[PDB]
Amino acid sequence: YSFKDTSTGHKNKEFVARIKSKLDQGGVIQDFINALDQLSNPELLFKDWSNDVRAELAKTPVNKKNIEKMYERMYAALGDPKAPGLGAFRRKFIQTFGKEFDKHFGKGGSKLLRMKLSDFNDITNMLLLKMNKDSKPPGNLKECSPW
Structure with missing residues (x-):
């Protein structure tokens, strides 16, 4: 959506909104x-x-x-x-990336400050390697996918 505030924009917005409501x-x-x-x-x-x-x-x-x-x-x-969604390998990954995320990448969410330098590719790479190795294919049972 890019609905500018003008009256045409606003009525268009409302029309789109009522569509979004009505369907699904x-x-x-x-x-x-x-x-x-x-x-x-x-x-x-x-x-x-x-x-x-x-x-x-x-x-x-x-x-x-x-x-x-x-x-x-x-x-x-x-x-x-x-x-x-409650994914299976999703649960496995979040379980493998709890306190590990808090330590490095999010600080509980408060990592938002440090946007000045972009070196964090290092943390990304070290995570991505170890998750690439010993990775698990999604379960042959779509019971790997609960819903």
């Missing part, structure tokens, strides 16, 4: 979506948002809003207890 009653579509998301992609999603953060870190510190919007992705993906 029950949101079972959103449920299917979210489910196959979290249980679909391997942790290399970490690599994905990591080099996205890498690109975005070259920007000025006023990019902290985008930095938070990129943190919230992985946070809702992993850190939140009883996260939506």
